[model samples]
Target chain A: ALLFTPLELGGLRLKNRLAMSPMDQYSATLEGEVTDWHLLHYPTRALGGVGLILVEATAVEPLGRTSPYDLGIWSEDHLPGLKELARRIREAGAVPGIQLAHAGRKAGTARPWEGGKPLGWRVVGPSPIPFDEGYPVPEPLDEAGMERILQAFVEGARRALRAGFQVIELHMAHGYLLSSFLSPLSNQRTDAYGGSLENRMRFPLQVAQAVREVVPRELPLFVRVSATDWGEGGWSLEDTLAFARRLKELGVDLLDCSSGGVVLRVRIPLAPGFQVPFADAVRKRVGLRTGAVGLITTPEQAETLLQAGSADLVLLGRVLLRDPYFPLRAAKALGVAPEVPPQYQRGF
Target chain B: ALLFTPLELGGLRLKNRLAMSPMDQYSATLEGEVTDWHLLHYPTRALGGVGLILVEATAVEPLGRTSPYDLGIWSEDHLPGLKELARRIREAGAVPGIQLAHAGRKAGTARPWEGGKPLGWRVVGPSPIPFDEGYPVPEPLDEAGMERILQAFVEGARRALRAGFQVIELHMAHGYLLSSFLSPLSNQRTDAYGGSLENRMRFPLQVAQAVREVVPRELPLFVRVSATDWGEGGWSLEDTLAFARRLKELGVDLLDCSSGGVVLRVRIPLAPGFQVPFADAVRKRVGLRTGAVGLITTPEQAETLLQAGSADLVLLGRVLLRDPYFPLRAAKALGVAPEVPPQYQRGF
Candidate 1:
């Protein structure tokens, strides 16, 4: 009756479907080393009894990063820190997952504490266009450039598997490279990669398929989609629902439903359970496993979505930010005590 | 001829030329009523011998707030808290000023802890454009709507003056309504309100003239401009210089040189005293009195800025966040007795 419902996803039987979606802590070292901040921050969530603990948006390539300080898996050096983190997450009784992202045109921006305006470095993308006017427009990918990025993602997946991640969620959301290609708003290129919806989703879906091929087959592959751009001409909900059907065909086991960020101007009306409906529509209308995110703060809200079959997984943001112990609180409030880790004698 | 030197701005004689630029600490009620957070946070800075103390970017109208919890000056109700704040700053020996702002397309957003997204509240601006997608794209203001906003600004200036502010600053920077009018990255209208430098600068310059016409003739006015959009075809440093000259011609007293927020790509690299270059450039290139902001942490850095003639004023953020006694510490380090508050004299 509560969120303690054990769910079988892919080959793993999760103790419960309570998921803590990926959050970019933006706390890596300048060279992308996993810092103490990262170590402390991630495990705190795992300790909260979130069945699935997704790491921050780790970059596949240094150039594709949101910042020089973003966590990276572009090299083997990243493996040791992640291995430690994965071990800790397992100790906390949550399955570790990694969400690999390429910020695309939004890449190469300074860190959050840094004025966050794109200027000092080059931002790479599908085309030679910048996210906004004042920053450097991206350098379009040549065949070699495209291949290099693809290899980087493949390499990142290999590292994630080594890091002991049981789930590999390829981050295709938030207007990153893959999602940039998927959403028509940012993908203005007229090449075979752009124009039609099928053409646009082609590059991203291929990445998803490629990730599925590389990661252990038993480890479920999820693609996070920004369901709609929420405007007149940008990415639409109808397109997203149709795309979810196609995602399933491409071996994507789950659709991490989210929305917006293709560019500015779409009005996102924020509400308590704002994006749950998108996840619901995706799961029911398009018949794909989906997770809800954005403004789903309270335990009752998350419980309603899952119990009502509106969403399969509940992902939280600022609420988790305010309290890392939110999962524990939610579990106790919803009587999902069985989801609590045995290591924590502090069961409410 | 160090930072200790006295200076005159408008009709007021500041003990030193160093003005504390306005900063918001989110210490206000949802209706924008001032709280202990604002009073204690700001007055202490003024007491530290900040010659001019500009209050945080206060809302002119509730609907125009950058954060729903921002301090407001729309009604007489806000006047008492502001008046008390003014009295405290005056007692601390700093000329009190207020920064009046309308956040424009970015209005009605949640507080920082609440995802910083747009609420369901109505937002109005020069055009229907948004600062970012999924956030509400503001409804394009009609001629009547345009006049109403301007009138609101004028009324706000009158209120600030009544609240005992000796100086008034129009927050045209950081891509608010006036700054958005200057940025091609956000303003894409085809009308006279949106094309060419003259057209782009029209709404903003009109705001300057509007502000100038409303405030006391003797009271100084400052116009903060987003010096560069941090990318191409957006607001440029050269544009800032030109606007600074025009603002001087419009009878404005100072230019607060700030940058970015023209778009969200955030590629700007950070170093100590990063954005100070913009203020220095504006001061030297345009021969205008300007204040430098962004990453000015230490009192030594503040003194060095004045010593190097980089800016007329040094505005500190995170450093003040760390220690409100920054000015007192700087004064001691600069080999002078700070205007320390009597209450804390024994401790020092």
Candidate 2:
């Protein structure tokens, strides 16, 4: 299997097909300075042989963080540690990707480990209505607030590129800022941006196009999408496929097909290979490469997906949290081991 | 509304209606002893005037624990702090409840805060399959293993009663051990306790009856069930309603209607009042009182459930996590002072 071989993702060449999912470290300080937790966490995974490692959800702006604890690439002052981490990841042979996110209405919650909910602190979104029915609803974003956010993403992508991230992924999944606008479940306004499917996708597309213009052509720009609304009268897989086609025309190299969070109350299945179907749908329907995540871990299972042409990459979350050596396990199962990490040779 | 007023369950009369949802505090040492985390975490909520306090899932047999860190109730040695914690919850005017669990095939993973999965850990269940596909499936439970697990829940209930708990909530919800037996989604055996719904539910019912035999007549034993399967070929609302009716006759004092974990890859709408209807459905169909969980935030929203006769109690997770003074908040929103905790007296 060529699963362990180098492959081109747009113009960025990955050492292998394994892509580390964008995780929320919440390890960064409130001021968004990278800490030892960041370096130690990523560098160890880099040493484990993943071809692509996307650093945790890096906010495009201070207000864009899902919580105060999320990492941000908004400021030049925030560049040093991120640059060092990127360098260390590159030095360790894994391509570094940054998943830039704007929390939208869901911004400024407590960290996931702290309980994955609103910090019960002040937060804002596209509408004045609360994210769910509780917690204070946010101040609705007017045109100025919305445009300010779009520009912030472009600026953040610029910072991430400067910080040496090889690829940029626009996190339009979950119930974040962009996904909020992209899903009819969350976007309830009567404005031109919320009435129809084409309108619902406008803000996210604008943000992605703006980012593509700022980032270089060699860097593969990816847009993660909520593949389904998973509810009545919300976004759907068909909408996602359509969005991916438009995104491809706008120069998004790949579509990251994730689902839910278009609304406050979406129930998703928790199983092995659950989200692979969405990724596969987006890949074939839109005629673009795609990455599958959500409960994919075993090397044999991942290789099967590749062998079946289901997904271009496998993003590991909880698995990587347990063992950073997962990519190496995949490599070994695929019958080849890249001789890197001088000391880890014996473990392989 | 009388929603927050004291209500009797078994012989225990609580000071208010709010019960601290039994949550796993990953503070225990590998030996399953109560640690400072339990003491500090429980007392904080307990002292804040919770009506009932259930210790985190206490595994009966060592192998039945969800993680290396779960509390154990099968042994007499596990009593000191829980005894003191009961006294503390009692001192704060709340009755105490202990949730006893067998993780089934879901056993042996690291903590949710750790790695929450089926790979790279020992897991065993009613069937050879893991909770879902592609994880480390357990060896199918032999007759002796089934006997041992039933004995664990029974003896665990006995110990909980001895520890001064006024209530015992059998942990059957969220796709845990008994839940695995309750649904066709996880129990795939052709034995006496698998395949059809009646067969699939037989083992957990036997375990419940065994637990009922151990508990005192005056002590209420609540069975928390995942009310809706949220997918195909799994537990349905009708199935849960039927189970609740049988459970009541078998001496279950109350039904706690929580949802999901019947299948591997289903989507649950994440919202404020999504699972409420499950509790409502079970209560109506079975003519039994039930508790509702899964995003019941806001005093008004919680009040609506009780006012509408949807559920007997609302188990608040993130809300209570955000505000330990929920009872006080409920009082204020309902237009009463609630004897408001002295520390926040001036502010209230």
Candidate 3:
């Protein structure tokens, strides 16, 4: 019943607490436009009964795309497809949300199936560092470059509004642009945008503030944060709590708590609800609504997380990809009457 | 392993023996054209690794639709959408198939979600008998009427070929047009097309023969038959075997075995793989490839059915609806490597 209960964040009323966490499909056209793949993929989950469908990480700029095939909202040319995508998800009975992201140091890689090798494009990050051994070292961002990325986020948020998204999530997780700036290991610059914890949080918080200002107050804005770098002397829960407090001050609605992806080769202690403690910490310490994500698979696990006051929302990632109707199945498992699509009622 | 083995029917080489059965969604446009719903619905199953994706029952004539929302193949206007639908399925790595049907006495009803009431269309069947109380008595088809319906089926088949479907199925099941003529309980006319077994098979056979003539020799033609009316002295498994023998002689490649759906109110036992026996009997008795459908939900069940020679292919209905990746999951469960999409490989 807790999972099925309605939750209101700003003016958006998610029909239930279950959210489809943003997961990249790498299924866009070569031109970085939304394709038929997205047309099917997102709406299917909405119809399957997810309350809040956060679309995959969509690039804020052409060079921001992790792969050439990633969806983009960098130009007016992308608006038509984005509008249609949002419309379909809304018509299918869910709040359509989009995660605006810049892959930063992670850019220019081939699709995962093609071996995810570097494609030799110029990559940018807070500091001149490589993600792992084979990955290219990214060029450190200058003041102009940081300002340009901030403006891109603002413009991306504006376009997302025009394209009819009810919620806008700034992807500050997974070692992406904003994420790299937040972690001490990735942000080694002595400039105002780097070095100390305050300097490290400077650029990310500015982008969050700009995005929040451009997006209407009624429309909820989410910031997906990598709670920790999952390594010693890197981003930690204490840093995430501080960041969450600032995000709440900037009018952000929820902290989508996820961990790692700031660096490679660190054991995450992966398990069901592994990163839930991050969401719980932020929600309690910062007095902010939090979305618990990462390996939160079962209905019971999700319901318990909410009931334990650990997180206000449970965001499912791979489990939802494997089972789009997990929300409906969860409703039934929790003994709540599922809102089965009439066409699919007989199956239930 | 048997379920994962490729199947050859006519010139079609299915990547595996699993199929997403033809289950109606009633999600087409008001004018009976394919919409974004079909665009997403069918191809998702293909991408999920179904070998053959049989699209829901599509009407051969406007008046032959079970609901106004059912997909239509009545005119050239429908071809573009149908072509796109077929192309997407093929591109997603599945053989796209369609079931051409005439709802007959079951025509012009509201969508199942709208309570499936009669929509006041002119319904026709083998006799002037109503399906049940509160249902209109269908006018018996005259010789001229039968010719018109048969020609419509031929034209629909011709257009289906142009639309790029690799397989074509004639819907002679579920109390629809051809099915009414097959069941003794529904067909009571003392004419060349009704009454005795030979007369009852006449109209359905004519439609099949005409459709077969229009279709290419290399492509597979399937006939979906309700093996039993589920009532005594009605259409039975014995009747289906006799009919299937005739279909094979007419070059039908496979019999998709489903049961019941003639006159209503018959208590049919429902269980997992409940209709597997019908498919097993028909395949052995008639020496024709058969597709076992109806409640065949799990990997082990599907593999065991194929290994025991119960059917050549397994057609999953509600189970596939619940999990489009049932085939992919089955592969993993049976210890066979799944052909997961590159975008979804991480989830697996």
Candidate 4:
């Protein structure tokens, strides 16, 4: 029954501890507007009784988009759709959350199905590093560029507030812009923004501070961080714990613990509940709530993680994709009674 | 139970009678290729033990798309994705099926979520009548255009064969191109292709025969017909019975019976199993297998229809969206032993 226990994430009261992880759905307008696909996709998850539905990685700037079709919070035009999504998710009895992201060195690639080849655009990062072979080498960020990106994150958070999202997650995992700054292998410059651990943390810390200033104090702001890059001399669990401390200091309520994606060759050992240890470590070391994600598929697995104090919540990806009503199924498997939406009552 | 009973449609032996209907996903490349969405979407339904998986309405030509994103089989380039989809569905233990469609006067409109306005382009129909008010009047298809469309259907079916689809359903319903040819309300033509029921059925019947000639004789062919247009002086059950008989003579195996979509304003009396009677009438009167669709949501509802010999199969739409594992759940509810895919065995 621990899996069905309600949790309070700052001001948002989730109906259950289950969360749907943000997965990239390349269904959007070229202008980055949310389409009808999202309208049904999220609400269905909510109807399935998922407590928190994290919308996919939305670009803070046009060039920051991994694909041309990724959702955007960069302009006023995206406001109406984003607002409606948040409202609908709330109406369907789930917390609406959005992840603001910048792809950095990994930017301007074709969609995954389109072969994901890098395009001829000036993608920026802490240093001029390419993600992998066949990817374009990114332009190193200047002071102006860093400041602009910081401002964009602030504006993106402000828009998330305006759109009525309960939670705003800063995507600092998965080799994105912020994660690029966190990883020593990617940040090799001698400036104040790189080299030493303190310098490497500078810009990302500033981004957190700026986003924290704009976000409402009562609302939870989550930071999704790769606990380890699973590569030599890469961002490690120790680094993530230190980063988690900074996030907690800046009033972030949860660390969504996930791993890998900073490098291509770093083979992450996959298994059920593989990332729970990362969340457990971050929670124990930094004294903050953590979201255990990556291969935590079953209700018993999710319940054990929470009961063992591995993390505060379980963020599911593929399992939820295969069955959106997973929380309801978890409810059944765990022998708990969580309300299903009236529309789907007959099915249960 | 009757719901879990296997049925032999021509050479393909379905695992059960439950089918996932050919709902328009509009989740394809602008060039009409299947995207990664179909890869996950269809397989999940297959994994859930649906005996038949009818891929969404796919366009046979460029302008025949319901929206710009509807799947296309007009070009050789579309084969790989379709092949993979069919292969994957079969791998997951379900019969792979596809619906070949052309939108006729309804072609070249915005996505249904985008308000479905007519785009400024040449659209063709059986007659020159527009679908509804504020819709552009379609150019009446002369001999050349009609021949091209007929050839397109044949080619589409041929590609379906090459793509590994065991079942091909010609979309002659939902007020689309072929349905426009069948309904008197839309087909006001005075030529050999229109006037009497025989004349109105002319183009559609020829398309069936042509597609049937190219498709393997052993492979089951389905024709979805609007048994009644739900409008007075429109295509009716009697017309559908005659059409169904003709299709049976041409070696078509099943009449996937559905109603309406021939006109916009004709109010369809919506309720559970509202269209079951149409399938029943067509099956009994025409002596051909029929598929009962429309709001047959629950396991009991599906089983009841088959037990009553109302229709040979129950084609589910929205209910399957809510639960891809409807067949599995139905097996549990109906007290039948249906095999779940080994990968999903833990859940069951």
Candidate 5:
């Protein structure tokens, strides 16, 4: 029943506390435009009763794309499709949000099903390290490059607003451009943007601040962060707590705590609520709203985490990919009547 | 398993034998046009690995819709949306089909969630009878009226072809216009189109013959029939056999056998695969391809029915409304690798 309860983030009132976590569909057109696949994919989950439907890791610029098919918000031509996507999600009863991202060393790889091989596009990060042994070494960002990316995030936020997005999430996790700047393993820069925790958090914080200034104060701005790198001498919970505290000061509404993908092949101790404690720690220490995501597959697991105050929202990823109507199923399992559309009432 | 095996009907090849059965969503625009709801609903099932995605019962004429929101194929204005819908389904790897229907005595009711009350439109049928006590008495169709409706079916089929539909199914079940003509309880007229089983089958057969003549020989033509009226002195399985034999001669490719809905308050036993025997009998005795639908759930049940020669195709209804990816799930349950889209392969 707690899972079905309404929650507020900033000024946006979600119908329930469940969110469909942003996950790359790798289904965009080569021009980085939304296609019929996206038109069906997002709205179906919204109609399935997800409270907040975060669009996947949309690239802030063309060369920043994870794959050739990644959606982009860099050009004016992308607006109409994004606008329609937002309208469809809103009409289907979910708050439409988008996660702005840059893949860093992970850029220009083929889609996962294509074996994730490099596509030979130039990759950039805070430092000149590759994501893994086989990955291409990323060109380290200069001051001009950092400034350009920061402005891109600002412009992306403005476009997201014009496109009718109700929420904006900065993708500062998963070894992405911003995430690489946060983790010590990836960002070995001797410059002011890396090395110490304060320096490593600098560029990500600046991007967050710039995006926050452009985004309306009433709309929620979230930051998805890897709480720990899950590797020796890497980003840890303490570093994330400090990052979250600064993000809270910069007007970030929720810390979506997910772990790993900042380093290669780190054992994550995968379990149902493994990442909930990170959300719990950030919520408690930073006094910020948080979203718990990762391996949460059942109604009871989601309910327990929310009831225990481990997180303000439960963000579903792979479970939603498998079952878009997990929220409806959760309603039934929790002994609550599902809020299905009139067309689907008979089935429920 | 047999469920995942490809099958050919006429010259059209279905990648698998599973079909998303046509079920009314009642979410179309008030002008009898498809809405974003349908754009998402149908194609999502196709992407979920259904072999054939049947668009729901669409009116053949303006007054034939069961409700104002039902899709219509009667007008040229409906073509663009239908074309897009069919394109989306085909691109998502499913054969797109449309069900041609006229509500007759069941016309002008509110949507199912709105208490199903009559909306005060004039209803027509084979006889001056209502579906239930509180229902309106329908105007009986005479010769010219029957001719107009038959022409509507022919025109509707032509429009369906231009709209890119690969298969056309005449909705002659669920106590609608055509089904009403086939039942003894509803078709009480002492005229050439009623009284005897042969007479009662005449009008429906005429509509079928016209539609089949218009449809290309390469494309499959299906006829959905109420195998039994489930009432004393009403249409029965024997009556259906005779109708099927005629349909085959008229070049109908498959008989989608469902039962009941001729009259109100008829007791019918309900269970998983309960209506399968009808499909089996029609497949064996009539020597025609058949589609089995109704309460059939689970991979083993579907495979067993197909393996035992019960039906050529398994059509899913409620289960699909609840889980559009039933085919993919069925594949996994049957120890077969699912044919998920590249984007969704990681989730599977």
Candidate 6:
């Protein structure tokens, strides 16, 4: 019953509790526009009866792209392709969402297939530190460059509205630009933008505030936060609780919680529902709705998580990739009627 | 004997008569640099025992790209990744080859999945002709634009040499920029670059000469041509015969003969060894070396083509995609010792 129950996030309603998580495709046009790959990839999930589908982590600026191949919302030229993707996903019976992101110090690396090696193109971060060995020391953003990037996210959010994306998720997870600014391990700056919890949260909060003011009040705005670094003296679950409280105050609708990627080389003792505790803790303590992600591969597991108050909603990655119609499969497993598209009615 | 025998083209020696046809993977850096996808994709086939691996139709310039996602060799910055690709293919014991291309009026279409609908980008051709309905009419390249694009290919070839590629194939087929200039349906211009057979061949010949003069004499330059446009009043096999003669005279070492893609509406008969006749005709009439491509799925079929003298070499496409270890599989079937990599010896 819990798995098949409808949930509401702002004005958007779901047919079920499962949603597809944002996954980078790097299959966009050279100019950051979505290609047929995105058109087909997203709609297939929608048709499979997922409640919501978040498009991949799209860049807020060109240089902020994880690779030159990552999708971007940094320009108006990209609007047409984005519009079509949102339209198709909505038509296929799912709420379309977009994750706006900036890769920060991790930007300009070769795609993962190529050892993800960093290139010589100048990258910017909150501090002048390099992410890891063999990565270049980045240029710390001065005042002007920071504002340009801030405005880029704001403009990107404005374009998302025009592109008809009903839900917007600001990417503050995975040690990207915002996550770097939030984590004390990466943010070693002396200015108001760095040191201490308040200073560390200043930039990320500014991004949330800037983006929130642009979208309508009824739109569900979420922030994906790396809940813990899983390492000593790094961004922790306690910090994520405080940040989630602040995010709720700033009109952010949900906390999409996950872990690691703040710094490298920390061993995460990974297992099923290893991160459900973080979501449960954040939801109960921080007084904000939360979403659980990662390694969630089955209907019983997802239903149990929701029924036991682990998370309000579940976001799936590899499981959805393996079965785009996971919700349809889950419906049958849970003894509910599968939501089938009219075109695909015969199959059901 | 034919499939296993070594064949010499200029200074490069193929281990056998099988080569992989150039096919777009739509996986590259946004700026057209090679990604790990390419590095792994090409080398795996080399280890599979193909004689030559023609790395896909890489664009000579950014706008010339078939899709924005097509592999590119237009910039000096692209050299390092390409160098690795060529080096890896050679290290794997296969001759490395690259197809230099410009997608012409078809440049700005989507990547096959999104219906491949053309966008409004100002694509260029020999004359103002839209390839199909809903496709934009491309601007005719003036003298300056033609020379610039010509120089791009020449410079592209020069870079390919520096990057350590042993063979270069001009993509003068596929209704791309050069192929459009050759066909009567696409090349409606009255200038010296169009009209009669001699005139239509002028610009392509100039491109051949410009590229030939810069590369080493012993380095083989192959030209892929649409042996027949397969439409009324379109480019014919007779036209290819004359074109192949001119190419051989210009020191071009081989004709990689394929057909169609001049205009979209023509119905090409689908069958195994459908286009081998084009290669056979070009080899016999022009007294030049030729490579056969299309639906060439098995070793016995490949051997028969060479034994019957239908073509000197067999270039496999879909068959290899389905099985990268095609050469090893074929070798086993044909009674030759499979050249298994030591790492893969356990599997063999």
Each prediction's RMSD over C-alphas, in Å, is 25.1, 18.3, 2.1, 13.2, 2.1, 14.8
Where model 5 places Cα greater than 4 Å from the true spot, the runs are none
Error of 1 at B20 (Å): 37
Off-target runs (Cα >4 Å) in candidate 1 are A338-347, B1-348
lDDT string, candidate 2, B1-348, tens digits:
666787777776766667777777656767777775465456556645567776778888777787787788767888886687677666556677888888777777765544565444666677766666656777777779789888888888877777788899998877777887877777778989888878877888888899898888888888888887787877888888778878989988888778887566898887888888888887777778788777776778878888888888777665444345566657778886666433234334
Return the top candidate by lDDT: 5
Q: Please give the ranking of all candidate structures by TM-score, highest first, separated by commas.
A: 5, 3, 4, 6, 2, 1
What are the per-model DockQ values? 0.01, 0.01, 0.56, 0.07, 0.65, 0.02
TM-score of 4: 0.59
Better of 2 and 6 by DockQ: 6
For residues B1-348, could you state the per-residue lDDT of candidate 4 as single tens digits? 988889998877887899999977767988999875677668767877799999999999998998888899999999999999999888778999999999998888887666768886688898889898767799998889889989999999988999999999999998999999998899999999989989999999889999999988788899898889999889888888888888888899999999999898788899999999989998887889999999888888889999888999899888776677778867978887658643244344
Q: After superposition, how far is residue A24 of candidate 1 from its true place, in Å?
A: 1.2
Candidate 3 scores an fnat of 0.45
What would the DockQ be for model 3?
A: 0.56
Q: Kindly report the root-mean-square deviation of model 2 from the true structure over all alpha carbons.
A: 18.3
Off by over 4 Å in 2: A120-122, B1-348
Give per-model TM-scores: 0.50, 0.50, 0.95, 0.59, 0.95, 0.52
State the lDDT of candidate 6 residue by residue for A148-185, as single tens digits: 98899999999999999988999998888999998888
lDDT by residue for model 1 (A277-306), tens: 889888888888888888877888788888
lDDT of 3 by residue, A203-301 (tens): 888898888888889899999999988988999999888888888988999999988888886888988888999999898878999999988889988
lDDT of each: 0.77, 0.77, 0.89, 0.86, 0.90, 0.86
The superposed Cα distance between candidate 4 and the true structure at residue A277, in angstroms, equals 0.7
DockQ of 2: 0.01
CAPRI band for model 6? incorrect
> Per-model i-RMS in Å?
18.7, 18.8, 1.5, 8.2, 1.1, 12.9
